Write a protein that binds this ligand. Sequence first.
Ligand code: NI
Length: 83
Amino acid sequence: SGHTAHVDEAVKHAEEAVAHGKEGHTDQLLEHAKESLTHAKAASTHVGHGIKHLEDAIKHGEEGHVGVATKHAQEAIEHLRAS
Ligand code: NI
């Protein structure tokens, strides 16, 4: 897709990852963070910050720290929305 659609899908999935994370839905946050990341990579400086945070969100999620994965996914949205 073009840049716009990828950024949009990256934001939407990151929003859904955040929403899952606040509910403690670790695997669902992971599923969406990974979809967000695929789109953010396909959209590829705002985007690069978003990618870094999504990668961090996935690492922390895989580590059982869904609060920390959530915050990183929120940070990714801020950056992706910047872009
Ligand atoms: Ni594309």
